[PDB]
Design a binder for this molecule. Structure first.
Ligand SMILES: O=c1ccn([C@@H]2O[C@H](COP(=O)(O)OP(=O)(O)O)[C@@H](O)[C@H]2O)c(=O)[nH]1
Ligand SMILES: O=c1ccn([C@@H]2O[C@H](COP(=O)(O)OP(=O)(O)O)[C@@H](O)[C@H]2O)c(=O)[nH]1
Ligand SMILES: O=c1ccn([C@@H]2O[C@H](COP(=O)(O)OP(=O)(O)O)[C@@H](O)[C@H]2O)c(=O)[nH]1
Ligand SMILES: O=c1ccn([C@@H]2O[C@H](COP(=O)(O)OP(=O)(O)O)[C@@H](O)[C@H]2O)c(=O)[nH]1
Ligand SMILES: O=c1ccn([C@@H]2O[C@H](COP(=O)(O)OP(=O)(O)O)[C@@H](O)[C@H]2O)c(=O)[nH]1
Ligand SMILES: O=c1ccn([C@@H]2O[C@H](COP(=O)(O)OP(=O)(O)O)[C@@H](O)[C@H]2O)c(=O)[nH]1
Lengths: 237, 237, 237, 237, 237, 237
């Protein structure tokens, strides 16, 4: 009963790190994710992780408050980096070899994203955190996830969410919605389901980047997914 | 026919003063400070501005939750940049020439701190924002405020806080908390009042750098200081 | 007493359009575009220009020959810079204030892309060339053209190609290839015409960013577009 | 009889490298320090070394000659880097794994200071040289020593000096002064003894960073100190 | 019958990578050179490789077309980098440990040239590619070859050419010319033979950097040269 | 009504000429050169200035003492920057617009060398100092002086030494040492005189770049050269 993936791209949204107040970072959560990621690395899995920033800032939201869209998306990106810092530290304190790279060159705090070094690091059993997303405004860390996954030739992008997977509708606002166990792009687009930003998904589809949606707040789920069990939704075609 | 009592200042904007209820950044406070800073610039005053990050993260805070103290300060310093980004945008949208420099090289998002480049810019009547403080862990922005304040040879360091001046304690927690209106670097010590952190204080005292503590949540407060009018607490030799 | 119909544009110069017979760069086309760009600048038009690299390398091309797709796009992106270098030189030798920025930091050879710095420069009537496109593999310059076009808030993206406009096919290969003169982001799709690559197209549609496709191998073509005269194909909502 | 320290921060003043003319660097001295440092690394000790610049330049001294204080401190910092280069080379020629990092980003000659990589390097038995001090003007490499020591969580900062330790007065200008074998901050400050720049010391005290003053020109002293013998003065509290 | 060189500097001209059209890169050729370089590394040889850009651009040629000489040499340098990218990829796909460094800092695509790291990498059996030449205009990659060879203390610079070696004249335009098996600088200069740019050669002579000219299109030649056989011409004194 | 005989020059200031008795930098010589350079700038002369480091370190010197030659040149090159820092400060304190660029990127302390940026600056009547010479080991600043001199298209390279002109030997060591007042790149060779180092000399000869050697320890010497008056030795074709 060994793992069914060699290299994966873990997409961690900003919310995932949110405590109970709705903002910031919750030390306890980070530590738990570190233990889970750790188990995967021990299991011989090469882990790349793209983190979001919803717990701190979103360019759109700021833009609405009157701020320039580009600068909003910049601050939002810096936020992803601020999260990566937290994730990395947790990994380190748990004695897991990891390194933070940023699309937005941030000398001192971490090194800049380098596809070459990224791969080398991956082939050396080190967790590689890709913050600052794609580095461009008008994009979501989800795109970053798909882009970085195609780049590092990940076997699959695991989209962590506070939900067991993809439902016929929002399973928290419509007690009728049912989860899917298997899905294909054409279907997701056909029935117009919510998996992620269209651009990021279009890209994943264009390169047949399998996507799996699972719940990150469900202890063990991560492991079950990589160990090929019944967890969340699978997206391919 | 009054006219300003200062030629070039070092304005320290505390991050906490950018919250405006509930963490995050308060767009409206930002828009207001751009206006008040705009007036000073039209008034011919050169403005260097050190910004804090208390509204997002404090190294020490994170450390107690378990994070590595040094990574905590890094996140903290990165918050100042995030705040420096929003403050610059407010300036720009108010049509005020401003540039953002960071102690830790961000590149692209903003400029790296360049002492010489900062002097030139101030001379050409442009607001120079300094984020990432001193750029070293274990220090505060108050320290940077003094350090940069001396570097650019500012006439005084205006510490913009949330209260009218230096009090005998947190006026929000101790009903028995009075503020002073005059202090010598001595008195502050021979009374051990809450102004900054000895390291920064000593620095200013060392170079006979006056300090004035005032409230930025008070519209027009800054201008009054600039016009030499009864405002906040003055700290001199 | 006509005068320009645009204040600030995003000129996308395809690399292939710089060949002029046999790969490489055609000095004479370069000298000519500097002249036509010089007129627009004297005409008061702010010019941001995204340049391609089709005359030297295309990631996808190299990939089929066996190279790593990502290293291929890198080479590709580096070609755009090489083209950005020659275009800037032509501008300079024509006495036109121009600066070259790269998505991937070259430093020394040219400047790193700085959104803010780009806005300032355009405002001071200086040509801002953007090379290395989006700076990420798997994307085209057309994408960058739209991405940057939106960033600097350009009035329109002028895609400078080798043909008079968007055709039903490659007019050089399909004798049955007609071009249109008007299209809605819709029609382009509900006809599936050759304009760009959905990713870039969608982007422009998303932000109601008009696009006009014209021939740069036609001396004076650009100016006519700028003067709002029957030229190329117009793509709007 | 094994070592009593696991990780130490070696503070080497500029003078230490001075030949007999009073300036520059003396090849012979460097080589000797390299052999001693080497022995420590072989002994399993993780060594971090902060070097000064007194043998070349001091910002204050230059300032007095009329030069700007900030630029003086800059040149002085560059000097620390110039020394590090020399120290590193010596370490390399003696086949000791070492790396120079600079607070002032100096691409090519060495890499920039990165707390993360610094620690990783330390955990890999490599000597880590921290030049350019803290990177800020108005500071001494002594502060840098204390700051870098607290950061890398060094077990103790060993302050090398051309004296056996801390005396009741200058043991070279008052034949009565006696050396201390043990001291505490409060005492040093109480009797106002000379250990180092007040700021650097205040910082060390604030974080209980044990400090040991010993003679670097006394062959073997370094080893005796780390091997817990009767050498120089100890400072804790 | 083991190798007679421990560390070599392989000078690969741009032409060497040229397909049959006269320009660009030929995937097939790269792959073959990768296999040969691979054999050398397996053989315990430390390989440093300086690549040219003649297959893409030469500053002089561009200058003649009217472009600024400096910018011409810049684009030409970027070309060397574009080749290095190709060479590196080939090495990687052939599972040979290699790294591209550039004299012209090119963050992301590769790292910048660092003599220190270069040597460390060499001592670790990794191919080190030195692109962007010397980094200065008015120089040839040949100089770069000699300069980088003296720096990395290479045992010899192997100048690959599409000719078996150095002839009394051009062996392709004068069927009488004969190849030399052994030569000395004084002789090359005396009889004024074509080996490389005078500057690069003067430098090599000044430091007694043995030079060997051989044919790179002659499968096995590389190996024969390093295995001390009868191949090409030797240049020393 | 004389007026200058040059529009733009390349002033090579030897480091040794900044000692003024005993190594180090002589504040008074610095203050004097700022004045003499100030006059040239007010006189409308564009000034690019290559600075040496002979007063602090010479790679070759260190090499003989045992250091790695390459690390020696690095230290050497870093001295030029240190000298470039003090010279810029003198300029600034004399109210002369000046910028310092380094061949090896220092960032923050000064600017990276930017050919284009240097041309723009000279055109806007600002002194552009070039430190770190060519930025490569094994070369001298004299080389950089010629290399940069050609790059910026200077009218002549003024080598500022410690003696009145090119002598038949060191006038301080050989009583039988006469200087010339006219030389052809030829004579210099067909007499093998002490002007620079063939590499740099050849370079200037290559591009018909005249050279004039004069004494900077002679107040007003520079201006006389600039005014085309009997001063130093002239080296032309
Ligand atoms: O490629 C990217 C990735 C992120 N962002 C910005 O940074 C924020 C990151 O938060 P995101 O919404 O992607 O994170 P998550 O929703 O996953 O918590 C976004 O809101 C954007 O403003 C961006 O502009 N481009
Ligand atoms: O020189 C500096 C300045 C700031 N910080 C960190 O960044 C935070 C900035 O917030 P600060 O408390 O200075 O802001 P304010 O109190 O002014 O709101 C600090 O708590 C530190 O963790 C740092 O480490 N070094
Ligand atoms: O955002 C970008 C823009 C370009 N490229 C690469 O660089 C080449 C640039 O040529 P492009 O086809 O964009 O130029 P054009 O078609 O306009 O001649 C592309 O083929 C890609 O390989 C890239 O990877 N990312
Ligand atoms: O954090 C620092 C460290 C050093 N320096 C400057 O660089 C010199 C380094 O010499 P220092 O006196 O620290 O060295 P040492 O006395 O140990 O020989 C100082 O004089 C300062 O001018 C600085 O400004 N800040
Ligand atoms: O130190 C160097 C190396 C290269 N180049 C430029 O980049 C090109 C590289 O091609 P080169 O002729 O050196 O390559 P090869 O002849 O070996 O194919 C040259 O033509 C120059 O324009 C340069 O200016 N300086
Ligand atoms: O292109 C350069 C210029 C200088 N240097 C080094 O830095 C020192 C600078 O001093 P130089 O002798 O050029 O100065 P000057 O003789 O003009 O006083 C040299 O000795 C070299 O070690 C170098 O390696 N490369």
């Amino acid at each position: 009963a060994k793992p069914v993936y060699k290299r994966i791209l873990l997409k961690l949204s900003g919310e995932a790190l949110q405590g109970t107040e709705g903002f910031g970072i919750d030390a306890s959560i980070l530590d738990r994710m570190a233990q889970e990621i750790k188990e995967l690395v021990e299991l011989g899995i090469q882990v790349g992780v793209v983190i979001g920033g919803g717990n701190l800032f979103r360019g759109a939201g700021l833009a609405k408050a009157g701020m320039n869209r580009v600068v909003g998306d910049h601050m939002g990106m810096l936020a992803t980096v601020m999260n990566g810092l937290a994730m990395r530290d947790a990994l380190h304190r748990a004695y897991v070899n990891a390194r933070l790279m940023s699309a937005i060159p941030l000398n001192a705090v971490c090194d800049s994203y380098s596809w070459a070094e990224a791969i080398s690091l991956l082939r050396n059993n080190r967790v590689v955190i890709l913050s600052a997303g794609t580095g461009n405004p008008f994009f979501t860390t989800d795109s970053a996830a798909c882009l970085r996954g195609i780049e590092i030739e990940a076997n699959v992008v695991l989209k962590a969410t506070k939900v067991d997977g993809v439902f016929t509708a929002d399973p928290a606002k419509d007690p009728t919605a049912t989860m899917y166990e298997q899905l294909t792009y054409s279907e997701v687009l056909e029935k117009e389901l919510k998996v992620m930003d269209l651009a990021a998904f279009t890209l994943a589809r264009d390169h047949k980047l399998p996507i799996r949606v699972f719940n990150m707040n469900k202890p063990g789920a991560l492991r079950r997914v990589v160990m090929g069990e019944k967890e969340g939704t699978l997206i391919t075609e």
